[PDB]
Design an enzyme around this catalytic site. Structure first.
Site, PDB file in Angstrom:
ATOM      1  N   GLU A 124       0.836  -1.191   0.000  1.00  0.00           N
ATOM      2  CA  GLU A 124       0.000   0.000   0.000  1.00  0.00           C
ATOM      3  C   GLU A 124       0.877   1.248   0.000  1.00  0.00           C
ATOM      4  O   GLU A 124       1.969   1.252   0.575  1.00  0.00           O
ATOM      5  CB  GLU A 124      -0.940   0.019   1.204  1.00  0.00           C
ATOM      6  CG  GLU A 124      -2.310   0.589   0.877  1.00  0.00           C
ATOM      7  CD  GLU A 124      -2.961  -0.122  -0.300  1.00  0.00           C
ATOM      8  OE1 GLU A 124      -2.866  -1.367  -0.369  1.00  0.00           O
ATOM      9  OE2 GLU A 124      -3.561   0.554  -1.161  1.00  0.00           O
ATOM     10  N   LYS A 168       8.136  -1.250  -2.523  1.00  0.00           N
ATOM     11  CA  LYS A 168       7.558  -0.498  -1.416  1.00  0.00           C
ATOM     12  C   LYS A 168       8.645   0.205  -0.612  1.00  0.00           C
ATOM     13  O   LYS A 168       8.526   1.391  -0.285  1.00  0.00           O
ATOM     14  CB  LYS A 168       6.728  -1.420  -0.520  1.00  0.00           C
ATOM     15  CG  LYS A 168       6.270  -0.767   0.783  1.00  0.00           C
ATOM     16  CD  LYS A 168       5.414   0.469   0.511  1.00  0.00           C
ATOM     17  CE  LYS A 168       5.129   1.258   1.791  1.00  0.00           C
ATOM     18  NZ  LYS A 168       4.469   2.575   1.515  1.00  0.00           N
ATOM     19  N   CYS A 225       7.177   5.759   8.560  1.00  0.00           N
ATOM     20  CA  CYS A 225       7.675   4.800   7.585  1.00  0.00           C
ATOM     21  C   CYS A 225       8.969   5.226   6.899  1.00  0.00           C
ATOM     22  O   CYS A 225       9.711   4.362   6.423  1.00  0.00           O
ATOM     23  CB  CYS A 225       6.591   4.486   6.554  1.00  0.00           C
ATOM     24  SG  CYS A 225       5.213   3.465   7.221  1.00  0.00           S
TER      25      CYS A 225
END
Ligand SMILES: NC(=O)c1ccc[n+]([C@@H]2O[C@H](COP(=O)([O-])OP(=O)(O)OC[C@H]3O[C@@H](n4cnc5c(N)ncnc54)[C@H](O)[C@@H]3O)[C@@H](O)[C@H]2O)c1
Ligand SMILES: NC(=O)c1ccc[n+]([C@@H]2O[C@H](COP(=O)([O-])OP(=O)(O)OC[C@H]3O[C@@H](n4cnc5c(N)ncnc54)[C@H](O)[C@@H]3O)[C@@H](O)[C@H]2O)c1
Ligand SMILES: O=c1ccn([C@@H]2O[C@H](COP(=O)(O)OP(=O)(O)O[C@H]3O[C@H](CO)[C@@H](O)[C@H](O)[C@H]3O)[C@@H](O)[C@H]2O)c(=O)[nH]1
Ligand SMILES: O=c1ccn([C@@H]2O[C@H](COP(=O)(O)OP(=O)(O)O[C@H]3O[C@H](CO)[C@@H](O)[C@H](O)[C@H]3O)[C@@H](O)[C@H]2O)c(=O)[nH]1
Ligand SMILES: [Cl-]
EC number: 1.1.1.22
Lengths: 460, 460, 129
Positions: free
Chosen positions: B161, B220, B276
């Site tokens: 995601e 990612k 993140c």
């Protein structure tokens, strides 16, 4: 207020020539005179064979030369009558002394600054177009102030160039932006706005960005550093892919679809070349060390170290695959220019890959469809070149009896070679080292033929 | 042609909730069950007040919750009846042992894989959505194969995601791309196509990217690293600007107008935060060390080192400007969230700037218009918090009698404060340290008031 | 995780500078649940060596089959002869899958094919996996 009607540009090279030709093409009522101490280059600019090839340049020059565009060796007179003087001379990396290999040599800029103030009276706008270190305009202003005459008013501006090899005319006619730097003084703003009026003849006002002088000088270096960082970043990912089973083209595609990142300049390669990427990053690193910014210096040094590591590990992959010895082995080098569709070889990765294989005693047969053979010999020289280096006339001669084919430049013709034919006349096992991802999608065919195909960013 | 008709998602957090809500909203004929071991969180999904806030999220759940969208604590049954199982559990950075502070803790992922293979029969597609290390799906496949049953066919996919805080619903309904990775086998390609068909209900086909499993996991991590690199690069330039007289906002604008570079994520700051960026970059560095890629490791380590240097030098600038001592001095910290328009403080630069000033014995008065005061106390704790930290309820109380105002978050209201009022009750000389460039254009008015105004990327 | 062997060599109860101490502390730093069996080392000595956490992570088993019951891996640190003769098909049945054997002493050499047939992933020092 002031209107620029006569323009002189010192330096009739890759920048001064095309830029002034386009200005002359777009500004019919402005006389544009390009000057240079190199008479052969100036005579070439007046000859029907121009000294630099750029698509569309011949048509633009021939439509203005003699009318409002002129190329001359009479530097002093061109300075005398110009309202605007472009400084577009070379600023090579110093190959000597303090700052060797990192600092820029400013001797040509200073010679211009001395010669300008020597031949100038009244009001003139002097504009730095060459890639210079930050605060170089401060040096020009000091020289001008220390040699000032009565009624001598020289304004100094920064106006970097962002054109790339091969698309100069399109980049000049439709630039992403025009960058102009000047002082925050009333005199500076009048000089900035006067130069804006020139570009406004064909560039929208929204594309003309005005900053202070130092922001303009720093922006040119930083822009090239950001571009080189994208290449080194994706090349660092290619090394991760080879060790994990990921594919760098798939990862680059996935990354590039984030519109905040963009999809440009994410093609993995054996390493970026060209005359400005390594030079401008190293200059940035040197500038940071001089300013006591070691964290910033080592931050940007990683762009260079990664590019060098990408080159070295590619040469190691060739040597390791060839049973740890390539002495007296014939190796085909397909592509010597630093990118496709050019004959420029400055800082090309093919040079470094070739020298690595030469240090191992390999017999190199080099083919490039556009690079002159005399340039390849000069680039590989410091003998060793005579014993090891052969310049082929076509790729099939270079691959005849070779152990491996090393593709370093993304020429489109390499995708279309007859590889079943090449495989028959190669020693076995036959290797293909694709340093540009040009053979993607052809791996199943090449493996069926019998090649062991290895490329950057793909696990073996 | 297999067809996914029931979807289970283990993990009803920031990722699992909204992603499944959008899938239910766009796929009315697919049953979507989001499960979690936290009952208070599951009930909050079924209550008229959601646990996580995202604009437009409340409308999506309320339009599906009961039709095809469900939030249960019965994990075993949801796994039993699902054709597709999303793993959306947390993967925190290991705080212990080998790889401390860099490696990810996979114990929650493994808990899912064991529980899935126990409660599963027949054909099921298991999809990694959490941020996992490269080759984590190989570990999931080993658990499934080592606990095989008759008629048990578990296919493992990667589907990361990319949503950001504040635009989750917008990003999920109109994503830049959907990334799906699976094995390059007929069993894997079939599972890939089934998951594409779900997204094909509302995502254009060209925006659905299919790769191998490892490219998907790596993409990612690399995507976040590229974004963080842009911020650290422009922050490194901000240090150069302060030492040369250039302006980072002018340079960033000039750089960003190159369409190959783009104009996004070039806003200099005291340092990037969020849950993140640092975690994924550090994980990438750790992965490169385990795979014997030290050049790649130190290349990406520079993104973190530059972010740490930008923070430390901003704190040192405050201390140096305040006559080299800030012991017992009152300092206002305006902004504690890691960005504006949120109450999230994870890895916020305000945390690190505050701890630097606390180490000097400063009296911090912290104001943030959205961060809960109890969160600020938790972030600044290990005492020291009781003696030095005061949490204000409006900015003027925090600036009352302070030596300096330190702006760490780009809240829009900080530009609109009454600075003549703040200056009157501040000790003299009064300083403003703008770590976000939010007061640009106000420097003349603030200097006329009497402030010494300092901001990142601008010479003092 | 089952720790088979705690003495620094076979046929003794001495544990001074035994590799089992350091191997155990590495796994304890990772939060593993260690079940340690040694046929001669006193159980009170094992507690002292692993002390400064011992209560939460360290369990001293009275037989090897108790230590391997429900374990992910069997780690052999001491070359006790009895380890070569254990019933590994029995151990494999009650181990979580996948089940690993880490032979730090080469005592299970020649038994690798049987252990692989049973279902173990067997790894030993000086042998490629
Ligand atoms: N090559 C590119 O694509 C490009 C792109 C942008 C910026 N730049 C920068 O532009 C500058 C010019 O680059 P170039 O490739 O056009 O260089 P160049 O060497 O081709 O051109 C400079 C010209 O100036 C002449 N010259 C040097 N000193 C002189 C003097 N005192 N008086 C008169 N003539 C003089 C030289 O003989 C030469 O013909 C460099 O600093 C470069 O970094 C290059
Ligand atoms: N913007 C973002 O936060 C974002 C963006 C992309 C990817 N991610 C990644 O998504 C993952 C999840 O992030 P999050 O913010 O949603 O976390 P979270 O903590 O909000 O949600 C995880 C949920 O999983 C539940 N859970 C954990 N183990 C479980 C188990 N064994 N069985 C059932 N439920 C279990 C937890 O109780 C919790 O409710 C992380 O790996 C994160 O790095 C985050
Ligand atoms: O994804 C990519 C993009 C480029 N390159 C390589 O990068 C080098 C530079 O190529 P390119 O930037 O197209 O050519 P240049 O003519 O050097 O142009 C650059 O250098 C000029 C000289 O300063 C600048 O003015 C331009 O803005 C900048 O594009 C070449 O070796 C390319 O093969 C890659 O390996 N991968
Ligand atoms: O030019 C910029 C842009 C951002 N930031 C900072 O960068 C941090 C991250 O901002 P942002 O990316 O918007 O926050 P996140 O909500 O964490 O989103 C990121 O992290 C997600 C994973 O958690 C990814 O999915 C998203 O694509 C990625 O944007 C914040 O501290 C910002 O203040 C800057 O300092 N300068
Ligand atoms: Cl030096």
């Amino acid at each position: 207020m002031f209107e620029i009607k006569k323009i002189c540009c010192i330096g009739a090279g890759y920048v001064g020539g095309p830029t002034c030709s386009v200005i002359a093409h777009m500004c019919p009522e402005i006389r544009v005179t390009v000057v240079d101490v190199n008479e052969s280059r100036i005579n070439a600019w007046n000859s029907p064979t121009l000294p630099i090839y750029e698509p569309g340049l011949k048509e633009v020059v021939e439509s203005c030369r003699g009318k409002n565009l002129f190329f001359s060796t009479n530097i002093d007179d061109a300075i005398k009558e110009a309202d605007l003087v472009f400084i577009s001379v070379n600023t090579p990396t110093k190959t000597y002394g303090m700052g060797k290999g990192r600092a820029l040599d400013l001797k040509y800029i200073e010679a211009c600054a001395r010669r300008i103030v020597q031949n100038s009276n009244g009001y003139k706008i002097v504009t730095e177009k060459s890639t210079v270190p930050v605060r170089a305009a401060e040096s020009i202003r000091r020289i001008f102030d220390a040699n000032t005459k009565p009624n001598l008013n020289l304004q100094v501006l920064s106006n970097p160039e962002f054109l790339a090899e091969g698309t100069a005319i399109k980049d000049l006619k439709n630039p992403d932006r025009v960058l102009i730097g000047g002082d925050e003084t009333p005199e500076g703003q009048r000089a900035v706005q006067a130069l804006c009026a020139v570009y406004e003849h064909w560039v929208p006002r929204e594309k003309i960005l005005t900053t202070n002088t130092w922001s303009s000088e720093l922006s040119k270096l930083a822009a090239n550093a950001f571009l080189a960082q994208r290449i080194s970043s994706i090349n660092s990912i290619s090394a991760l892919c080879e060790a994990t089973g990921a594919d760098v083209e798939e990862v680059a595609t996935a990354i590039g679809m984030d519109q905040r990142i963009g999809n440009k300049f994410l093609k993995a390669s054996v390493g970026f070349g060209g005359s400005c990427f390594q030079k401008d990053v190293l200059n940035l690193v040197y500038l940071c060390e001089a300013l006591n910014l070691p964290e910033v210096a080592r931050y940007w040094q990683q762009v260079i170290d990664m590019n060098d590591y990408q080159r070295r590990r590619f040469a190691s992959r060739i040597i390791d695959s060839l049973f740890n010895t390539v002495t007296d082995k014939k190796i085909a080098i397909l592509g010597f220019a630093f990118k496709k569709d050019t004959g420029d070889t400055r800082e090309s990765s093919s040079i470094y890959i070739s020298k690595y294989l030469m240090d191992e005693g390999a017999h190199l047969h080099i083919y490039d469809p556009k690079v002159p053979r005399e340039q390849i010999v000069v680039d590989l020289s410091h003998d060793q070149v005579s014993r090891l280096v052969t310049i082929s006339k076509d790729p099939y001669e270079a691959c005849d009896g070779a152990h491996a084919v090393v593709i370093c430049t993304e020429w489109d013709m390499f995708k279309e070679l007859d590889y079943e034919r090449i495989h028959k006349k190669m020693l076995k096992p036959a290797f293909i080292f694709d340093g540009r991802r040009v053979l993607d999608g052809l791996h199943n065919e090449l493996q069926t033929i019998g090649f062991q195909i290895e490329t950057i960013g793909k696990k073996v």
